[PDB]
A paper describes a structure:
Aminoacyl-[name] synthetases catalyze aminoacylation of tRNAs with their cognate amino acids in two stages. Malaria parasite genomes encode two different lysyl-[name] synthetases (KRSs) that play a role in translation in either the cytoplasm (PfKRS1) or in the apicoplast (PfKRS2), while Cryptosporidium parasites and humans encode one copy. We present a selective inhibitor of both Plasmodium and Cryptosporidium [name] capable of clearing parasites from mouse models of malaria and cryptosporidiosis infection.
Further CpKRS:ligand structures were obtained for several compounds within the chromone series, including CpKRS:5, showing 5 to bind in an identical manner to CpKRS as to PfKRS1. There is a high level of sequence identity within the active-site region of PfKRS1 and CpKRS (96% identity) and an overall sequence identity of 47.7% and similarity of 64.6% across the entire protein. Furthermore, structurally, the active sites are very similar. The CpKRS system exhibited behavior similar to PfKRS1: an accessible binding site and a high degree of flexibility of the loop and R295 in the apo-state and dramatic stabilization upon ligand binding, which, again, was supported by the large observed shift in Tm from the apo state to the l-lysine plus inhibitor state. This provided a rationale for the compound 5 affinity toward CpKRS. Compound 5 showed in vivo efficacy in two different Cryptosporidium mouse models, the NOD SCID gamma and INF-γ–knockout mouse models.
Numbering used by the authors:
A (entry chain A): 45 to 545
B (entry chain B): 45 to 189, 195 to 545
The structure:
């Protein structure tokens, strides 16, 4: 790339020649979309010589047809406009025609002034009098993502993706639309949006390993939040009744097609709801959003590339329920031992994992073993949206005991195409039990479970002030957008995803 | 505490007796606000014995008037409702009347079922048949209620309507702000809070580590360098509202995480951004207050009240000229010369201004502005045209040598906004980044390392662009009339 070097030299040339060098302000008359709305339907060959307008965008094409005529395409805000620059119309106060145009390259951000209309062949055009180089491009660009060095370039240099690929631009617009729809749903129910800390003295609220940091003046270690749950529940103690939060969680684990170290989640807590109420809301909210985007409840998905097969995901309600333990037992052809957290059941579940070639967790806690078994036997049955329900207490330290089922909790997870989208429960509000499950979590952490959380006394003290019967819920926004926008890699739906070295 | 131990014992006794112990679901008939709207203007003494309703809230008052009659107030969703519990209405299949009510204490979350109406004295009431303890309070509550309010925010919310108001106002303000930019065609985005290289402001970062990637990371101090990459990418009008993390001081206007809004607008300059700032903020003030002139208590609610006037046009102060007016003498040129650095140290010594460390031209300029210029900004006031040497991402001023197209907005001497015509020329940008890396190497912990990924993005052509940041928490402080940032953040950082 002599190209980059030579462009730096061209620019120092222009600068030293007293020619326009990175002008501070270019005043457009209207956006390119506005220009196409206003003039896109004029007759072929129409020109309005009584109207002078200024436009700007990035140059996608330059073709000099003759010594007297240059055609540009400029692109901005999803619209292309042709610029026809005829030597006879050039404003010599800006420089000589050939000098002015010799400064421009494909990729440059440029301004033009001229008369509006359409060429004889029917192309929406600006018949220019002047051209201004606003911000040059110092690299030779490809014309499509196909011409990049790797397809990793799309994620390491997202601005290239965005310049070249309409599909990538549509994803981020759909993401905003979906989030707006969600905020509207809850705002109409009378919820209050809140923000709770992302720096925590004690991390909690999920099965996740945290990022650790330190505040120098406070002389204290802090964790990045894994989830907002413990703070949100304190707002229900506080009487706020209906709260939600949409923001980042930080989880220090692996990166793959469905995991980024920071990701966006929504949580809500609703006083007087139970998990049955929450299943119903989940179904209403998500089917409404699918409808809003797709116009029916049966939507396409390409689980391999858009070069692979298309399947259909059916969101018609109500959705299938699978009971966690029973579905495991059906996959095994035999019962788990009771109690589920006894050493007898631990041993059995290790034996089952070996028998079914399921990779063992570390450490081999009852909860982690159950999770591996569910992963293999239950989550794999979840093609259409399906609730896995009634998780064991031993894996659910903040979920309230099941009103009917010994050793289980009033919990669900939503899975779509084998991927977890939501997690929700009737909230545990009984402090003695809450403390005991926190102690069991602390014991698991001490034994090497990097996903187990420490005891949070601040939270136990809050429960002692009385948490009303409450239902809470979380949704992974990024994974939702993967299904709505038909993407199979979370890197498609996050602007600047985490990338290896 | 005996009260807490005893309450645990009571709850075990209840459990062992087979009486209601943390019921899973209580189905209300309607909310307390709906109940008050439906029945609140009935005739005194009215009762409808044909309608049975279930209501719930937190008990704020218990008055056992007689052996036969107990009065409660419950509170839920900002509405109080009286419950009148008469032994002659009690459903004995829930327990004997004295047993059922003996389980209840001030602070408990409870449900009642009964008949709707109004007492003779004209109190909106439920005439109850039953009571269900849903979630007991194990602590004796104060009747009304700073350290506890921030460490146990649920107590503040439970007892103090003024705290609930602040958080509702916060949400309303941020909705207003979203609406403003959405109507202009902006796209809301999210950029990384975990950064290989921190940048986009002058701040000490938080440091962390990603174990699988085996890499140290920084928490973002600002989203700016990623957001500008989106303008290179063609997204034209982007905003982000989210947390920044700065490993610095904690005081009345600083919390280690805070909410900032940034936006980037292709084709704008800083003049456009001042006009937008005026329009946005004066319009929000008017929406909330009904006037452009609003109260503020700078020393808290025990002190004096002043008036902040948001009427436009807002005052502009030029950075260097206002320092020079304060000094009664000119700074030396160039502003980043050792001569000027040494002169600014003399001026700090003379005017009793605490010296920065290290004694860089930028830090000394900042100290002088803080003393002479920020202190003149009562009403919203733009400090404009900051020197380049303190503004490494701001584009050179089109007229004024050594300066940039930058502003800060100050209100009551506190920074609310920072904005500029963006530097889009990569040779100068690299030079200024080198100067920052040199500053860091000499001891400036607020200087950022060079980010080659950003320099490469600038080489692809950043359109002329204007960018801007607003401190949301400090805005709420003004709009809500609080002089401590801990009042506008639900769970502010507290000393250990
Ligand atoms: O969306 C995700 N999961 C679904 C939830 O568990 C998310 C939280 C909840 F919203 F509260 C309930 C549903 C998800 C996305 C990630 O990129 C990710 C990265 C990790 F390092 C660890 C877990 C991750 O999980
Ligand atoms: O609102 C604040 N400052 C105003 C701004 O600089 C904020 C960023 C901007 F919005 F982009 C432009 C305006 C503010 C609030 C804090 O709690 C805080 C804490 C610290 F540790 C360090 C700086 C802090 O700054
Ligand atoms: N904190 C949960 C989501 C809410 C669960 C119900 N309280 C998670 O991160 O999975
Ligand atoms: N990143 C700046 C605000 C935006 C300035 C204009 N690009 C700050 O943290 O102060």
């Amino acid at each position: 790339s002599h190209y980059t070097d030579n462009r730096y030299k061209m620019m120092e040339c222009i600068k030293d020649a007293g020619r326009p060098f990175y002008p501070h302000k270019f005043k457009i008359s209207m956006s390119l979309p506005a220009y196409a709305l206003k003039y896109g339907n004029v007759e072929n060959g129409y020109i309005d010589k009584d109207t002078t307008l200024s436009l700007s965008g990035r140059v996608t094409s330059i073709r000099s047809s003759s010594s007297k005529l240059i055609f540009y395409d400029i692109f901005c805000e999803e619209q292309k406009v042709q610029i026809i620059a005829n030597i006879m119309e050039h404003d010599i106060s800006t420089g000589e025609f050939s000098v002015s145009h010799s400064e421009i390259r494909r990729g440059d951000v440029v301004g033009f002034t001229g008369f509006p209309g359409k060429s004889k062949r029917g192309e929406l055009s600006l018949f220019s009098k002047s051209v201004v180089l606003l911000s040059p491009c110092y690299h030779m660009l490809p014309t499509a993502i196909s011409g990049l060095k790797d397809q990793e370039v799309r994620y390491r240099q997202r601005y290239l993706d965005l310049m070249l690929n309409e599909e990538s631009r549509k994803v981020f617009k759909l993401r905003s639309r979906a989030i707006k729809y969600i905020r509207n749903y809850f705002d109409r129910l009378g919820f209050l949006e809140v923000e709770t800390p992302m720096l925590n003295m004690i991390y909690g609220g999920a099965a996740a390993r945290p990022f650790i940091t330190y505040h120098n003046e406070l002389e204290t270690q802090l964790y990045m939040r894994i989830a907002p749950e413990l703070y949100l529940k304190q707002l229900i103690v506080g009487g706020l009744d209906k709260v939600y939060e949409i923001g980042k969680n930080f989880r220090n684990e692996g990166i793959d097609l469905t995991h980024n170290p920071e990701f966006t989640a929504m949580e809500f807590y609703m006083a007087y709801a139970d998990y049955y109420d929450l299943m119903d809301l989940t179904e209403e909210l998500i089917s409404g959003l699918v409808l809003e985007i797709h116009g029916s409840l049966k939507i396409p998905y390409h689980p391999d590339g858009p070069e692979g097969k298309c399947i259909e995901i059916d969101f018609t309600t109500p959705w299938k329920r699978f009971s966690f333990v029973e579905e495991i037992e059906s996959g095994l052809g035999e019962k788990l031992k009771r109690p589920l957290d006894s050493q007898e059941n631990i041993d059995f579940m290790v034996e089952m994992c070996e028998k079914h070639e399921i990779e063992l967790p570390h450490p081999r806690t009852a909860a982690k073993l159950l999770d591996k078994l569910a992963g293999h036997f239950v989550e794999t049955k979840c093609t259409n949206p399906s609730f896995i329900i009634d998780h064991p207490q031993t894996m659910s330290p903040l979920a309230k005991w099941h009103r009917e089922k010994p050793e289980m909790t009033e919990r669900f997870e939503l899975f779509v195409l084998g991927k977890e989208l939501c997690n929700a429960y009737t909230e545990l509000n009984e402090p003695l039990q809450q403390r005991k499950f926190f102690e069991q979590q602390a014991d698991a952490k001490a034994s090497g479970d990097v996903e187990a959380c420490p005891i949070d006394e601040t939270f136990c003290l809050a429960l002692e002030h009385g948490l009303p019967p409450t239902g809470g819920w979380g949704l992974g926004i990024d994974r939702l957008i993967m299904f709505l926008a038909d993407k199979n890699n979370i890197k498609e739906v996050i602007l600047f995803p985490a990338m290896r070295n």
